[model samples]
Target: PASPNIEAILASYAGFRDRDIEGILSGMHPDVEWVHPEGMGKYGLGGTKLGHAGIKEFLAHVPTVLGGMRLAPREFIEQGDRVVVFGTREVTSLRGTTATLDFVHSWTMRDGKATRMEDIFDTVAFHELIES
Candidate 1:
């Protein structure tokens, strides 16, 4: 309502926790860009996902390797069309490896729809837990 940028992201994060893929995609533009670091590529979750369909494909691939993930946002810094969120994630691999790490999630919004998103985190720590 107030800060549409922040609100949209908050909703999407909630959707993620609920496993409602459609809900998460609803706030995104058809051509939204979803970006993750290359470090995750080996696990099939890296690179950039172009458009909503690509985002969905990436989403589908997540569960195959990651058993579960929980994100807790600590702060949200909104400036114009950009919003940067600082958070912590608890990730558990399908093999039962788990770890908590800090993350920075950035998003760009236009007319109530998200146009781009990037997640930056400690991939070294993630890979260690995941491959353990």
Candidate 2:
């Protein structure tokens, strides 16, 4: 049960920054669970996604709303089977509006892959960015 793939998790973040879909997916288990807060539902990015197929669907939805962004992970705290990341993301929406959000992402790793992840961020800022 001590299958913490700290490198894999970190690499996935690099992959995300590089816009490499496959690279990021490589760090996820086949039965991985990706969850975002329900408050983001209106943006089609909230809720839980199961496995590769579900994750892909979520990733696909991203491009429709987001142009791109940078994830600046300031800290990485790792335990037995968990990694909690604290970061700020400067995100650009498709509408050309940008926002800086402080985020917390808690990851659960198993068998050298991430099994589950849940993230929450500054929703108020996101809302303003989208509506502005």
Candidate 3:
């Protein structure tokens, strides 16, 4: 079995795809900082989500706005407690239009919990894709 922390982090992703908010929060610390760029989503940049409660709220709401989405991280680079994951996400709009994009996530882990998560991706392209 993998280390608990590693397993937890990996499991959280599964929850995301399944839209299982409870499962996603199972691995999160009491205080988690999750931030994505502003003006990225179809409406606008999702503000930073602080703490587990806020994180859960964000997760719950985000899926409703996107349809038939898929995200797969292809590469993982880890040094000590820091890890960077690069991935591609394909989201199909309600009208059945698909957009695939590359995204990077830089994470800082402490005591087996992700303390900070910063998502790196092109905001402008994402907005345009959804609007198209």
Query: Which candidate number would show the highest lDDT if scored against the true structure?
Result: 1
- List CA RMSD, all candidates: 1.2, 2.6, 2.1
Q: Among these predicted structures, which one has the highest TM-score?
A: 1
* Clash count list over all predictions: 0, 0, 1
Q: Pick the winner on TM-score between candidates 2 and 3.
A: 2
- lDDT of all predictions: 0.88, 0.84, 0.76
Sorted on TM-score, highest at the top, how do the candidates line up? 1, 2, 3
lDDT of 1 by residue, 16-115 (tens): 9898987798779998999999989889889899997898798888888888889999999998999999989998978888888899999999998899
Which residue pairs in model 1 clash with each other?
A: none
| Model 2 local distance difference test score | 0.84
lDDT of 3 by residue, 1-132 (tens): 766566667787788789787777766677888988876544534658889887867766765665666889888777778878899999776567899998998888788778888888887777666666
- Which stretches of candidate 2 lie above 4 Å from their native place? 1-4
User: Which is the better candidate, 1 or 3, if ranked by lDDT?
Assistant: 1
Q: How accurate locally is residue 123 in candidate 1, as Cα lDDT from 0 to 100?
A: 88
Question: TM-score, each model?
Answer: 0.94, 0.91, 0.85
TM-score of 3: 0.85
The local lDDT score (0 to 100) that residue 94 gets in candidate 1 is 80
Greater lDDT among 2 and 3 belongs to 2
